[PDB]
Structure 1
Amino acid sequence: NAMATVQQLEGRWRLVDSKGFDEYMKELGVGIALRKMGAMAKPDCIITCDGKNLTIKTESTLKTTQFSCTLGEKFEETTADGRKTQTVCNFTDGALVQHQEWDGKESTITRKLKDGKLVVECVMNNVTCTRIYEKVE
């Protein structure tokens, strides 16, 4: 994915498209009552990366979560759905890669810039979710 800077990902983004998010949440083990609220939301995403210090805010009018970390160093993340995972974030090959592990399970969220839009790609097992954000200018 070329030689992009992580700075190109920085800033405030807004969801404009989502496909397969409900299927992905299912694979995580999220309850219907929760999946309904999750898929219904039009969240913002605020990404800030100072050198290797990464912070991602996931914000909706009802619920807001965030994580902060150092690229390359594992940390305990509390996800929005309530999972406690061992997560490492890396900016590899021009893409922000968030790898999660918990209870013997695995999931990877990959964020890249493409055609000016933030392309978020969530993967667990055979399930792939693709969510598109655009810059809030």
Structure 2
Amino acid sequence: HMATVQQLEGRWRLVDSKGFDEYMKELGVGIALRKMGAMAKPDCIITCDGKNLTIKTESTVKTTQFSCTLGEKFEETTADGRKTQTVCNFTDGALVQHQEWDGKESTITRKLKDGKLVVECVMNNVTCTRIYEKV
């Protein structure tokens, strides 16, 4: 020191955190988003062009949704933070996943349609389709 601002530029990778959960709580961050925040190894990117300063974050969130035996009911912990009663079946060429929690209910279907992974979700009256391509 004294450090210039050019000394802070580049990519920085998280290696230690303390009290972050508490910090998010004091901002008013909800539990689900909080757990997401703490499971992410964010990269911080800083650049400074004279007085002009930019800060970017880049976090990958590698996560196991669930492991299960087909046909065996289990307790799922979801990304949004529900504790559901889930059973998966491979039925008629499709991978069905049925979620029960709080008396509510959702089904998620996964089929192969023209080499693409068509994913279909259903709750009450609300549906949703996602297409994936193989890597």
TM-score normalised by structure 2 residue count: 0.56
Identity of aligned residues (%): 99
- Whole-Å Cα distance in 2 between the matches of residues 63 and 100 of structure 1? 22
More relative contact order, 1 or 2 (CA 8 Å, 6+ apart): 1
| Range that drifts further, 46-55 or 88-97 | 46-55
Q: Secondary structure at the residue paired with 2:60?
A: coil
* 8 A contact 1:24–1:128 mirrored in 2: no
The alpha-carbon deviation at position 123 of structure 1 amounts to: 0.5
CA separation of 1:70 and 1:37: change in aligned 2, threshold 3 A: closer
Deviations 1:15-65 (A, max 9, x none): 999999999999999999969999999999999999999999999823534
Once the two structures are overlaid, the 10-residue window that deviates more, 75-84 or 58-67, is 58-67
| C-alpha RMSD of the superposition | 18.3
Rg (Cα) greater in structure: 2
Q: How far has the Cα of 1:4 moved from its partner?
A: 62
Change beyond 3 A, Cα 1:35–1:126:
farther
Give unmatched runs, 5+ long, in structure 2: none
Verify the 8 A CA contact 1:111 1:118 in the aligned structure 2. yes
Name the SS of the counterpart of 2:21 in structure 1.
helix
Instruction: Kindly tell me the number of residue pairs found equivalent between the two proteins.
Output: 134
Q: Is residue 43–residue 57 contact of structure 2 (8 Å, CA) maintained in 1? A: yes
64-73 vs 32-41, which moves further: 32-41
User: Which sits farther off after the overlay, 61-70 or 17-26?
Assistant: 17-26
**Runs of at least 4 residues off by over 4 Å:** 3-60
Residues 74 and 111 of structure 1, relative CA distance in 2, 3 Å threshold: same
Shift of 1:97: 0.1
| Long gaps (5+) in structure 1 | none
Does the aligned pair in 2 maintain the 1:21–1:129 contact within 8 Å? no
